[PDB]
Amino acid sequence: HMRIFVRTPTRKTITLEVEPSDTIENVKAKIQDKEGIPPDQQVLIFAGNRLEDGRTLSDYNIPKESTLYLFMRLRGLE
Amino acid sequence: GSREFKQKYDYFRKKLKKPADIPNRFEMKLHRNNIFEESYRRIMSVKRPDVLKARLWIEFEDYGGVAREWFFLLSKEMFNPYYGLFEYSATDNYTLQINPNSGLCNEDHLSYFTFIGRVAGLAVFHGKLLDGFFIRPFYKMMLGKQITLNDMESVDSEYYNSLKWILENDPTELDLMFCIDEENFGQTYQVDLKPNGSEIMVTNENKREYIDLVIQWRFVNRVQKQMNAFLEGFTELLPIDLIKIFDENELELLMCGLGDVDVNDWRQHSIYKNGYCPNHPVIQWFWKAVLLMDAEKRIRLLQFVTGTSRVPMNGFAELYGSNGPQLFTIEQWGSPEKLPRAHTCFNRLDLPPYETFEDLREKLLMAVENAQ
């Protein structure tokens, strides 16, 4: 109704309550609440794919009880 | 060995050369809360890497002391798996390996591996240390040495035994092919260990080649670009053939230092609760047990009770929990048939009052393995 999991590389699994309507941008906002990480500093990956902030969970065919993978962004020389 | 390390080391330092035509100082001004990205821009923007060889003058917001702090604080970020450059080598390990998927995580990853190489070479050039644990094959790969079956054992001992079994026995019953299941982001892929691999059967005659290909896949093949970029940055300050006088154990000591916990500093800054005292018997048995364990065990014990493998830069006096300072704490809890318990957010060990030393020792060891 529905639940997903976000695995960090620091051996932590975050539980989120979401719905398929939710944009990636909004999922990241929930993560920022529970974790302190500014959404633009978030990289989410599912099934080998980086997830764009504009698209939605439904768009990526992310079913119930799925695990996403989170990473912090590096910005490079700009 | 350490005796040979010191002889080689004094020779090593004498051969390192500071060029005469660089500024006499390399200045950095930084904010602790952005230390990674700022050190990265400053150091990766220089036209000439040799200016890194000068005296470091570093300011956040004694210079040798701020430099020490910088090396330490930057190591925590460079060796932070959140960025996806490095990853834990196993679910039950504190050692880091290169993330083969670092590129998906961040497209600029090669530039950061080169940077981390530069900082590592820079530490060594200045006789300082970074702070972190890498898997042993990392250092062998720095030296160009072949990775082998025995190298698997310190990373993944069950897989090591599994491959040793294959080496020592007839593997026909196993029905193995030169295929391997690779897992990335929860998904499983079949990859050929060599061309047409999944249709080549493992036999007594080719199983040595199979084992070698599994080892290359495990540690070498998927991280070459990242490792090569690291080495580019590492050799931008230190010549490779100078580096190669060192073996892989010595190289780790040179770069990342001892890898062990000071039991005395640990003991002399712990707090006891609910009955326990510095001379209480159960406590003396505890610190006697800690003295007798090896590095891997002391580190796993530190991780078990504090949640991390890293000792504070100024030792256990400055240990932190989740809410500011929090000295290491042992408190009496439970009954001697119980295994001890850990509260990591508060650096607290729940330790039953066992009756013998030997019993505390086995129960403490068993609790430690049993945690993940």
UniProtKB/Swiss-Prot annotation, chain B:
Protein name: E3 ubiquitin-protein ligase NEDD4-like
Active site (record annotation): C345 (glycyl thioester intermediate)
Protein function: E3 ubiquitin-protein ligase that mediates the polyubiquitination of lysine and cysteine residues on target proteins and is thereby implicated in the regulation of various signaling pathways including autophagy, innate immunity or DNA repair. Inhibits TGF-beta signaling by triggering SMAD2 and TGFBR1 ubiquitination and proteasome-dependent degradation. Downregulates autophagy and cell growth by ubiquitinating and reducing cellular ULK1 or ASCT2 levels.
Domain of life where this protein originates: Eukaryota
Expressing tissues: Ubiquitously expressed, with highest levels in prostate, pancreas, and kidney. Expressed in melanocytes.
Start and end residues of each HECT domain: 48-372
Clinical disorder: Periventricular nodular heterotopia 7: A form of periventricular nodular heterotopia, a disorder resulting from a defect in the pattern of neuronal migration in which ectopic collections of neurons lie along the lateral ventricles of the brain or just beneath, contiguously or in isolated patches. PVNH7 is an autosomal dominant disease characterized by delayed psychomotor development, intellectual disability, and seizures in some patients. Additional features include cleft palate and toe syndactyly.
Domain observations: WW domains are involved in recognizing PPxY motifs in substrate proteins.
Subunit field text: Interacts with UBE2E3. Interacts with NDFIP1; this interaction activates the E3 ubiquitin-protein ligase. Interacts with NDFIP2; this interaction activates the E3 ubiquitin-protein ligase. Interacts (via WW domains) with SCN1A. Interacts (via WW domains) with SCN2A. Interacts (via WW domains) with SCN3A. Interacts (via WW domains) with SCN5A. Interacts (via WW domains) with SCN8A. Interacts (via WW domains) with SCN9A. Interacts (via WW domains) with SCN10A. Interacts (via WW domains) with CLCN5. Interacts with SMAD2. Interacts with SMAD3. Interacts with SMAD6. Interacts with SMAD7. (Microbial infection) Interacts with Epstein-Barr virus LMP2A.
Post-translational modification as stated in the protein's UniProt record: Phosphorylated by SGK1 or PKA; which impairs interaction with SCNN. Interaction with YWHAH inhibits dephosphorylation.
Source organism of this protein record: Homo sapiens
Whole sequence portion shown: 594 to 969 of 975
Subcellular location field: Cytoplasm; Golgi apparatus; Endosome, Multivesicular body
Induction note: By androgens in prostate, and by albumin in kidney.
